[PDB]
Amino acid sequence: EPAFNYAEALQKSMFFYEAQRSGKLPENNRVSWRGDSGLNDGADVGLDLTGGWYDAGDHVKFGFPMAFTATMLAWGAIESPEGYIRSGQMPYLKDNLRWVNDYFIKAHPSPNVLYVQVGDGDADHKWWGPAEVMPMERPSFKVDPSCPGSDVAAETAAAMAASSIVFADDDPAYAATLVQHAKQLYTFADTYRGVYSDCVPAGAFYNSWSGYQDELVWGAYWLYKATGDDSYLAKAEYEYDFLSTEQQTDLRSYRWTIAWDDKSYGTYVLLAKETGKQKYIDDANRWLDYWTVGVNGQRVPYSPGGMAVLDTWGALRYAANTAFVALVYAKVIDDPVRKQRYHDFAVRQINYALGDNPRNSSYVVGFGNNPPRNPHHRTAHGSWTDSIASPAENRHVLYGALVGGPGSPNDAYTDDRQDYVANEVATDYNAGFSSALAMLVEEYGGTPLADFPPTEEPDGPEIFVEAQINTPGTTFTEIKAMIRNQSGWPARMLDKGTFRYWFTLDEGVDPADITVSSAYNQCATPEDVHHVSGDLYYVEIDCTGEKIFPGGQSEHRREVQFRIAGGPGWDPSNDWSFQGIGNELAPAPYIVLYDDGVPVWGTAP
Ligand SMILES: OC[C@H]1O[C@@H](O[C@H]2[C@H](O)[C@@H](O)[C@H](O[C@H]3[C@H](O)[C@@H](O)[C@H](O[C@H]4[C@H](O)[C@@H](O)[C@@H](O)O[C@@H]4CO)O[C@@H]3CO)O[C@@H]2CO)[C@H](O)[C@@H](O)[C@@H]1O
Numbered sequence: 020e021p022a023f024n025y026a027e028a029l030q031k032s033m034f035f036y037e038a039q040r041s042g043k044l045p046e047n048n049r050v051s052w053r054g055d056s057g058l059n060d061g062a063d064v065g066l067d068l069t070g071g072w073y074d075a076g077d078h079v080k081f082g083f084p085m086a087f088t089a090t091m092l093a094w095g096a097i098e099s100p101e102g103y104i105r106s107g108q109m110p111y112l113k114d115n116l117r118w119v120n121d122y123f124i125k126a127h128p129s130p131n132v133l134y135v136q137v138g139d140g141d142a143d144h145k146w147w148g149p150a151e152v153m154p155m156e157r158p159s160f161k162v163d164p165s166c167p168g169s170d171v172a173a174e175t176a177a178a179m180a181a182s183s184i185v186f187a188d189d190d191p192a193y194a195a196t197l198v199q200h201a202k203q204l205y206t207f208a209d210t211y212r213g214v215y216s217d218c219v220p221a222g223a224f225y226n227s228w229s230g231y232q233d234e235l236v237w238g239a240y241w242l243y244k245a246t247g248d249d250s251y252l253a254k255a256e257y258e259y260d261f262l263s264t265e266q267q268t269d270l271r272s273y274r275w276t277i278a279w280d281d282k283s284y285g286t287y288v289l290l291a292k293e294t295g296k297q298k299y300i301d302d303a304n305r306w307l308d309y310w311t312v313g314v315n316g317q318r319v320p321y322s323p324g325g326m327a328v329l330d331t332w333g334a335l336r337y338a339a340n341t342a343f344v345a346l347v348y349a350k351v352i353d354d355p356v357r358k359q360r361y362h363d364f365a366v367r368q369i370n371y372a373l374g375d376n377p378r379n380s381s382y383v384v385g386f387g388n389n390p391p392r393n394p395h396h397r398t399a400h401g402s403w404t405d406s407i408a409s410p411a412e413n414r415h416v417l418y419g420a421l422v423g424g425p426g427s428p429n430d431a432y433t434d435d436r437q438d439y440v441a442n443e444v445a446t447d448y449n450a451g452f453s454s455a456l457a458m459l460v461e462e463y464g465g466t467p468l469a470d471f472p473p474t475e476e477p478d479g480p481e482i483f484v485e486a487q488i489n490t491p492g493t494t495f496t497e498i499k500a501m502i503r504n505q506s507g508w509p510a511r512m513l514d515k516g517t518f519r520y521w522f523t524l525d526e527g528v529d530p531a532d533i534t535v536s537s538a539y540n541q542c543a544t545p546e547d548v549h550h551v552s553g554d555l556y557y558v559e560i561d562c563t564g565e566k567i568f569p570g571g572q573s574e575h576r577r578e579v580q581f582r583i584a585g586g587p588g589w590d591p592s593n594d595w596s597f598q599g600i601g602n603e604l605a606p607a608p609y610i611v612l613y614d615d616g617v618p619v620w621g622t623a624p
């Protein structure tokens with residue numbers, strides 16, 4: 020039996036990806052706390068750019084890492100389709116890949132034009148709240164021959180190519196369409212050279228630190244696989260010689276690893292696997308050795324707990340990416356010693372992430388023992404006051420998300436939501452991780468949870484009305500009502516609200532003489548009252564036009580003070596809406612709040 024249930028981890032990983040979706044969500048949506056969002060993406064350029072994935076805990080749709088994630092996800096499915104079949108996750112993987120690939124098609128309106136970003140990094144990062152109610156404008160950026168982006172373009176080509184292979188048997192039509200798009204994108208990237216971060220304002224988030232050379236090799240190889248066109252393999256091998264060497268030696272880079280920016284490492288193994296040339300094998304060997312035994316005395320930093328810590332930001336992601344590729348290489352190399360080394364290294368790194376560490380805790384949200392509970396994720400947190408600090412605990416469980424983890428080689432970590440360097444989550448963080456999981460399911464087995472996902476229930480009323488007697492009076496009843504929108508299942512706008520306060524006509528009180536005034540009212544103040552039947556009447560406060568949403572202190576609520584003066588004879592004790600209203604602001608169950616005529620809170624007479 021496996022040390023950890025890899026099938027379950029994988030199953031949750033796929034759920035995470037579904038939680039990262041943007042656009043109009045399907046009817047079959049598994050994440051109850053996610054609603055439609057980014058519905059006007061692309062409007063600024065008259066295009067429909069809805070869909071795709073939110074990059075991390077933020078809401079900007081960064082094309083570069085989104086494309087990479089897609090390729091890594093497809094890669095793992097090509098390596099171990101059995102792993103996805105066994106864990107019963109194959110349909111979800113295809114579903115997730117279809118989601119991001121549909122978007123890529125939407126974003127490629129012509130052969131040499133690719134939209135690589137929707138949203139502004141700074142503006143988007145200045146606000147902290149659920150995606151469904153984002154209040155900022157989201158500009159769409161692109162790359163064309165006038166300002167190319169060979170890296171992002173070639174990656175998107177690789178993404179669509181690799182996926183076409185996955186859909187090949189299921190949807191030959193779809194597969195063909197991805198292949199067609201991929202060729203155009205690769206051509207565009209090879210013909211118009213350039214770094215995409217020179218054209219789109221993503222440099223502060225996903226700067227093209229290595230250039231496009233690695234993507235030209237990467238993209239070529241994958242198109243080769245999808246098409247079978249030998250010229251593509253030729254293209255890859257040629258471009259391979261132009262890869263980055265290290266410091267002073269003529270040796271190709273071996274001290275880092277494959278991630279959204281640098282695909283050099285992937286190509287070492289991929290071409291070695293394809294051709295079997297010593298040239299590739301040496302590079303792949305040197306890289307994987309630096310991560311295991313070391314080369315020339317140098318070795319990637321290791322913690323006492325056994326974790327390979329490459330950098331501070333998203334440490335587990337790097338180790339996980341290497342763990343996957345290592346497993347892939349472990350099957351092609353004949354060397355018994357190396358095969359063991361790489362394979363054992365991979366299982367160790369994945370196991371560490373799943374719980375086998377000094378803290379004996381999982382680093383995969385919602386999985387294992389003592390998992391993280393507060394990752395740096397806006398929608399998962401569910402703040403309604405534009406604050407990362409409130410509420411204390413994330414209101415949702417982002418099942419399957421792999422956190423950054425220990426940024427230093429000391430196995431230390433603190434589940435702090437405000438730590439985006441170690442506690443943020445991301446689509447690419449789970450890319451290499453998921454592929455490794457699929458390989459491990461095929462080998463060590465595991466079984467998915469029959470009843471998953473659990474259906475979360477709201478942590479209280481989401482949209483309600485609170486009230487208290489503002490000023491005591493005997494010929495009138497002055498109320499201080501506070502409309503609230505703290506929704507999270509999912510977050511929703513409340514722009515057509517109205518509420519009713521029912522009261523009973525008293526002996527000696529002429530309705531004609533009843534007045535409704537206010538000294539402070541963020542909504543409208545009505546002139547007359549409304550007779551229902553008999554002695555039953557009601558005051559209607561109109562808040563339509565007011566955008567009440569869980570995204571700020573003043574945004575989520577509307578204060579309405581209102582005095583109903585009836586003169587001598589006025590008696591609030593027989594009034595329906597008055598039941599329960601004390602001197603402290605508290606939910607008023609008898610004041611009905613309506614969203615466009617539909618009751619959302621309270622009970623009517
Ligand atoms: O020089 C060594 C090596 O560098 C490689 O590039 C690194 C780069 O040095 C490093 O700064 C960068 O760090 C990224 C990180 O990988 C990424 O996960 C994170 O993403 C953020 C994003 O910036 C936010 O906007 C938001 O969306 O959240 C996410 C997740 O937190 O951002 C940081 C900073 O940009 O990673 C690069 C890739 O490893 C070169 O590729 C390599 O060739 C060099 O040898």
Ligand SMILES: OC[C@H]1O[C@@H](O[C@H]2[C@H](O)[C@@H](O)[C@H](O)O[C@@H]2CO)[C@H](O)[C@@H](O)[C@@H]1O
Pocket residue numbers: 075076077144145407437439443
């Ligand atoms: O880019 C780093 C990190 O920023 C996070 O948003 C920050 C924002 O950059 C800062 O100006 C503001 O004061 O605080 C917010 C919240 O920490 C963003 O949420 C991360 O995704 C991103 O990785």
Ligand SMILES: [Ca+2]
Pocket residue numbers: 170229230231232233234280281282
């Ligand atoms: Ca690159």
Ligand SMILES: [Ca+2]
Pocket residue numbers: 522523524525589590591592593594
């Ligand atoms: Ca009365």
